[PDB]
């Protein structure tokens, strides 16, 4: 199937340059049209613009054309957008899709396929990897990790590799009052597993290159 | 560009209803409308295209119909999986346009949370700071208060919450409220509670332990 | 017992949208439906008798269809006067059943709130006890954070919110928060002053006052 | 214009009974069928029952019949609510109302509000906010039970700029709540500022002069 893997986000200072690049599999990407569109977060959806199969055609919405363009390397299977003059109100997960439901003599589409985003942070602020502490357990018990004091976000917070997904709950992280984010990740497990069972999290801040893997013990 | 509205900007309704969203546009556009679904946490979804099209692979609850310039988007059968974000953007002219989405809440039974307390650990204690971690586990409605005593003496302004998106498989929410304390403000105390209020509950629930 | 399902529960719409609202009678009641508006911390109010028909008085903008299980309220264009709980009731037989109601919020522009702090009055503090209340009037989104700050350090202890439905002409919000000392305790600190972020204001705005000033 | 009154709401213990009167004015109350309905706080309407002009038509809500007796006074213009071995699921907002067309409510009292708790009645404390273009300025009404307390200014005069916020439940388990009015400031010393305050389950009213 078609698969589309966003990459280069992250903390960029105000007024600063990015490139984003997409790479796909699943088809061939020389005989599509691609396209990128964003999200503030907990804000809605914006159309960046388009890049037909031959560049030949490059659309944006006016009001972003300036500071963003758009390429495509055909051999790479690699989609790309460059980012300059970054404002604060640039922050967002940028997605690329891949266009397609033409059929239509006219210039129109649906999206029928997006990447998972990638999240482009602008701050003066500077990076920080985060603390990772262990919320010890006391039927159901419930067990987590503090992933406290990181900037920018995101951090990625999986259990025992990826083997325990059920009653876990990774909480939307907050600004505390220092600038610095900081989370919670929880699962609640039979009280008869603590003692035989190991629970391991492992934390994951791609902007500092950190990755922790902590044992929570009661 | 075309100005495309949404309406309702939000709502909540029971699994087994049928809801109806619209989308207006501030100018004709014929068919060239799409319906996206953006689940909690994930990217968006195709739906349908051209007004009334499913995009392969989608349920045949869900439904598009209209022209020009007043669209409709229904789901005839509400299920749990179907909190999302929906959002119509118009394929007419450039730039594109999107709505500003319909946030889709389920409504459901009440169910009270299940209370868990978590000391600082001996690790963070090293740093010289002290987080106090309360977790308010599967609850509906969404409102619920977290009180915090410290020595049952109520506190303010030193803590701070985090509720999760409504879950897709049971319609429920968690949170968690951390009070953080200087280690020398936490080594001076002994009882720290969290007392909960919610519909679910008759009485407020009060998790504690010993410092 | 004819059950009465309406839907959504809820609802947040803008000024001038049309807004439809559905109620699903368990058995058919023929036209014997009717609806009824309750605004915030008012009574129940007549709108909508028999299915369509508008009752005296009531706003053109107001409209009603359906027959036998099925039946739609419909507010052709919202106006701000709308914010309330929309309840429909079957009149077919006894006993006579209502709809559980749709809530009906307004979603607006954002509104900074002004900031007022009051210092516990002279009749108050004879009586053992200091309340220091911190009013945001007129806000929007309903999302704030206020904070205590007593001598310029933040203040840990006995504060309480409330706040109030949307208004009916502005469709914003109004919040008091309140702390609660004793005597003593009030008398421990000179500078009381509450702190304010909302979504409208820029930075934070803090309002205060000195005891015995 | 048609006007309905409750009254006769408060505090009631698990087991209690209470009546509940609806004084009716504009309107010839004995060619008239008259209803109760309720609502629990927070909650939808609920439909109690309903009593023809000469009393041989009295017809309740299956589930309520032991709980509710309707009757009415023609010569007096009232409607009774005889409320018998309340429990705590009976605390609500008490309505009468009138149907008409022939089956809906046309009019509707502003309801009274019966709690049905093991505490005791508290009359409340009521302080003076005062402040120091728009200036705030309000009355803090501290420590009652059960509810409701009603709020005015300058006896009615003053409904503009008015928010009388809803109660909160202390650590103590009485309510306490806040009325504040927002007045141009140019007027502080000019007017005088009085809420009136009153709480009928305990038959307290109290003027409090607001000054800077
Ligand atoms: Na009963």
């Known amino acids: 199937e078609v698969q589309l893997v966003e990459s280069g986000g992250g903390l960029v200072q105000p007024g600063g340059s990015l490139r984003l690049s997409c790479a796909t599999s699943g088809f061939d990407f020389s005989r599509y049209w691609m396209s990128w569109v964003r999200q503030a977060p907990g804000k809605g959806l914006v159309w960046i613009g388009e890049v037909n199969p031959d560049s030949t055609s490059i659309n944006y919405t006016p009001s972003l054309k300036d500071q963003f363009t758009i390429s495509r390397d055909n051999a790479k299977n690699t989609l790309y957008l460059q980012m300059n003059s970054l404002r604060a109100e640039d922050t967002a997960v940028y997605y690329c899709?891949?266009?397609?439901?033409?059929?239509?003599?006219?210039?129109?589409?649906?999206?029928?396929?997006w990447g998972q985003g990638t999240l482009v942070t602008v701050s003066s602020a500077s990076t920080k990897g985060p603390s990772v502490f262990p919320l010890a357990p006391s039927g159901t018990a419930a067990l987590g990790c503090l992933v406290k004091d990181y900037f920018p976000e995101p951090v990625t917070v999986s259990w025992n590799s990826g083997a325990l997904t059920s009653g876990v709950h990774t909480f939307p992280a907050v600004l505390q009052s220092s600038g610095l984010y900081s989370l919670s990740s929880v699962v609640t497990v039979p009280s008869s597993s603590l003692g035989t069972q190991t629970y391991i999290c492992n934390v994951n801040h791609k902007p500092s290159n950190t990755k922790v893997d902590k044992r929570v013990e009661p | 560009d075309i100005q495309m509205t949404q309406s309702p900007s939000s709502l909540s309704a029971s699994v087994g209803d049928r809801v109806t969203i619209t989308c207006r546009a501030s100018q004709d556009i014929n068919n060239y409308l799409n319906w996206y679904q953006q689940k909690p946490g994930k990217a968006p979804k195709l739906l349908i295209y051209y007004t009334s099209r499913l995009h392969s692979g989608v349920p045949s609850r869900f439904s598009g119909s209209g022209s020009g310039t007043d669209f409709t988007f229904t789901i005839s059968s509400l299920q749990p999986e179907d909190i999302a974000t929906y959002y119509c953007?118009?394929?007419?002219?450039?730039?594109?346009?999107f709505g500003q989405g319909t946030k889709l809440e389920i409504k459901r039974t009440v169910a009270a949370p299940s209370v868990f307390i978590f000391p600082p650990s001996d690790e963070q204690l090293k740093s010289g700071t002290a987080s106090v971690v309360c977790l308010l586990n599967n609850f509906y409605p969404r409102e619920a208060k977290v009180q915090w005593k410290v020595d049952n003496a109520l506190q303010s302004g030193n803590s701070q919450e985090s509720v999760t998106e409504q879950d897709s498989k049971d319609s429920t929410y968690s949170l968690s409220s951390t009070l953080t304390l200087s280690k020398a403000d936490y080594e001076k105390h002994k009882v720290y509670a969290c007392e909960v209020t919610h519909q679910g509950l008759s009485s407020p629930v009060t998790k504690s332990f010993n410092r | 017992d004819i059950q009465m399902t309406q839907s959504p529960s809820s609802l947040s719409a803008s000024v001038g949208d049309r807004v439809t609202i559905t109620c699903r009678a368990s058995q058919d009641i023929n036209n014997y439906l009717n609806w009824y508006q309750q605004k915030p911390g008012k009574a129940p109010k007549l709108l909508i008798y028999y299915t369509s028909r508008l009752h005296s008085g009531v706003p053109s903008r107001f409209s009603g269809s359906g027959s036998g299980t099925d039946f739609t309220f419909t507010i052709s264009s919202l106006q701000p006067e709308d914010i309330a709980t929309?309840?429909?009731?079957?009149?077919?037989?006894?006993?006579?059943?209502?709809?559980?109601g749709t809530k009906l919020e307004i979603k607006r522009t954002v509104a900074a709130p002004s900031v007022f702090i009051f210092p516990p009055s002279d009749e108050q503090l004879k009586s053992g006890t200091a309340s220091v209340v911190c009013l945001l009037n007129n806000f929007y989104p309903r999302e704030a954070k206020v904070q205590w700050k007593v001598d310029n350090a933040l203040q840990s202890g006995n504060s309480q919110e409330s706040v109030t439905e949307q208004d009916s002409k502005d469709s914003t919000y109004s919040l008091s928060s309140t702390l609660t000392l004793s005597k003593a305790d009030y008398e421990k600190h000179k500078v009381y002053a509450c702190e304010v972020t909302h979504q409208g204001l820029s930075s934070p705005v803090t309002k205060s006052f000195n005891r015995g000033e | 214009?048609?006007?309905?009154?409750?009254?006769?709401?408060?505090?009631?213990?698990?087991?209690?009974?209470?009546?509940?009167?609806?004084?009716?004015?504009?309107?010839?109350?004995?060619?008239?069928?008259?209803?109760?309905?309720?609502?629990?706080?927070?909650?939808?309407?609920?439909?109690?029952?309903?009593?023809?002009?000469?009393?041989?038509?009295?017809?309740?809500?299956?589930?309520?019949?032991?709980?509710?007796?309707?009757?009415?006074?023609?010569?007096?213009?009232?409607?009774?609510?005889?409320?018998?071995?309340?429990?705590?699921?009976?605390?609500?907002?008490?309505?009468?109302?009138?149907?008409?067309?022939?089956?809906?409510?046309?009019?509707?009292?502003?309801?009274?509000?019966?709690?049905?708790?093991?505490?005791?009645?508290?009359?409340?404390?009521?302080?003076?906010?005062?402040?120091?273009?728009?200036?705030?300025?309000?009355?803090?009404?501290?420590?009652?039970?059960?509810?409701?307390?009603?709020?005015?200014?300058?006896?009615?005069?003053?409904?503009?700029?008015?928010?009388?916020?809803?109660?909160?439940?202390?650590?103590?388990?009485?309510?306490?709540?806040?009325?504040?009015?927002?007045?141009?400031?140019?007027?502080?010393?000019?007017?005088?500022?009085?809420?009136?305050?009153?709480?009928?389950?305990?038959?307290?009213?109290?003027?409090?002069?607001?000054?800077?």
């Open positions: 953007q118009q394929g007419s002219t450039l730039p594109f346009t």
């Open positions: 899709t891949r266009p397609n439901y033409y059929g239509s003599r006219y210039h129109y589409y649906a999206m029928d396929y």
